[PDB]
Every structure is written in C-alpha cells, then in structure tokens.
Amino acid sequence: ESQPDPMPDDLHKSSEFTGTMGNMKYLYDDHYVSATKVKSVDKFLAHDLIYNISDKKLKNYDKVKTELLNEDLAKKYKDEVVDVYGSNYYVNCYFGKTCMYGGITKHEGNHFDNGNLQNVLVRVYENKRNTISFEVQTDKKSVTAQELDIKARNFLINKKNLYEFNSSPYETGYIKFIENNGNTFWYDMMPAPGDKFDQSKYLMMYNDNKTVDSKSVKIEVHLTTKNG
Numbered sequence: 250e251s252q253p254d255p256m257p258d259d260l261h262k263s264s265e266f267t268g269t270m271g272n273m274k275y276l277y278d279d280h281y282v283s284a285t286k287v288k289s290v291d292k293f294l295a296h297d298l299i300y301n302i303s304d305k306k307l308k309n310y311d312k313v314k315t316e317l318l319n320e321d322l323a324k325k326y327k328d329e330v331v332d333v334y335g336s337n338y339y340v341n342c343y344f345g346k347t348c349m350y351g352g353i354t355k356h357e358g359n360h361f362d363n364g365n366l367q368n369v370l371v372r373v374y375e376n377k378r379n380t381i382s383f384e385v386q387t388d389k390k391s392v393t394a395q396e397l398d399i400k401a402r403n404f405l406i407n408k409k410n411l412y413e414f415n416s417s418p419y420e421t422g423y424i425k426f427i428e429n430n431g432n433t434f435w436y437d438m439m440p441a442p443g444d445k446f447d448q449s450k451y452l453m454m455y456n457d458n459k460t461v462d463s464k465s466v467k468i469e470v471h472l473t474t475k476n477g
C-alpha cells in the first residue's frame with residue numbers, strides 16, 4: 250500500500266525554520282545534474298556510484314557521486330548505460346566534485362519515438378483550492394519522481410515565489426505522486442525546523458531512486474499560506 254497522506258503535524262512549517270531559505274531555493278532554481286548515456290566509473294561507499302559528468306554552464310564539477318538507498322541498487326546500475334537527473338550539493342560532499350542521491354534510469358528502451366516529449370500535469374492547490382496547473386516534460390518513459398519534483402519546484406519558484414532568500418510565502422507544502430496502480434507517495438517541500446538547513450539530509454529522500462510512469466502519473470502540489 251501507499252504512504253498515508255500528510256496529517257497536520259507531519260508537515261514542516263516554514264515559520265519554525267529560521268535558517269536561510271535561499272538554501273532550499275538554491276536546490277531547485279535552475280539547478281540539476283543531467284547526464285545522458287553514461288556508465289559509472291567508480292564508487293566510494295558500497296551504495297553509491299561516481300560518474301564523469303561535467304556541468305556545461307558554470308564549469309563547477311566534472312565528477313558526480315550519486316548515493317542510493319542500498320548496495321543492491323548500486324549493483325544493479327553499476328555497469329548499465331543510464332541517464333542521470335537530480336539535484337546536487339557541495340556542503341558535506343566528500344569522495345570539481347559534486348554529490349546527489351538517486352536520479353538514475355536505464356537508457357535503453359526508456360524513450361518515446363520521434364523525439365517525443367511527455368507532458369506531466371501538475372495541479373497546484375493553495376489552501377485546498379486548485380489555483381494553477383502546469384505541465385512538466387520528460388523524454389523518459391520511466392522517470393524519477395526526483396526529476397519531476399525538481400521541474401515542478403523550479404516552475405513554482407519563478408511563477409509563485411515558492412522559495413525566496415529569507416523565507417517562503419507558504420507555511421506548509423507537499424508534493425504528491427499518484428501512480429496508475431493506485432500507489433501514492435509525497436515529499437515535504439519545507440525544511441526541517443531550526444536555524445540551519447542540511448541539504449544532504451534533505452535530498453537524502455531521493456536515494457530510493459523511485460521512478461514513475463511519465464505517461465500515467467499524476468502530481469498534486471498542496472501548499473498553505475501563512476495566516477489564513
């Protein structure tokens with residue numbers, strides 16, 4: 250069965266977060282590792298994989314380490330030709346090196362024809378009303394929930410100021426994936442309470458490498474505002 254939906258005390262509140270909200274913004278605002286048709290070159294811990302991947306733009310890294318939930322997942326992908334998409338960090342990253350979690354899909358067999366892109370509808374609720382809906386895209390048949398989440402958050406940062414440097418216009422926020430077998434799961438879009446944001450611990454949720462069928466999955470973002 251599904252992860253049950255958030256109960257009230259399940260969700261992080263931005264007002265109980267007194268660190269820097271730019272640290273969350275930074276992770277999703279035009280920020281991702283993406284590499285295409287790659288094979289792992291190395292390992293640090295038993296559950297991760299290192300890839301030779303350069304950032305086209307700001308030439309910040311040329312090796313990426315992705316950590317996975319378990320050793321079996323690292324074994325499974327070790328020698329496969331894969332596509333990689335995820336959110337990267339430098340704070341507490343050790344192995345121009347950069348770190349992430351999950352983000353791996355096999356290359357072969359995993360694309361639509363004719364260079365087709367698949368649109369995935371994201372419906373945004375604010376205080377339980379459907380205010381906007383937009384579409385994110387992927388060329389991948391089986392896509393990581395991480396990658397879809399990243400795309401949807403990037404759009405929301407720009408359109409709805411989901412995150413700013415100081416804090417957020419929003420108190421709570423979660424993203425919900427509905428699979429066509431009935432399976433649902435969700436991620437808290439807000440930082441853990443306190444004065445520091447731990448990026449590595451935040452992104453750690455993506456280490457399950459959870460993938461969804463792009464063509465049938467639904468996405469709901471549910472946000473609440475500050476007062477009422």
Ligand SMILES: [Zn+2]
Pocket residue numbers: 285286331332355356357359360
């Ligand atoms: Zn591919």
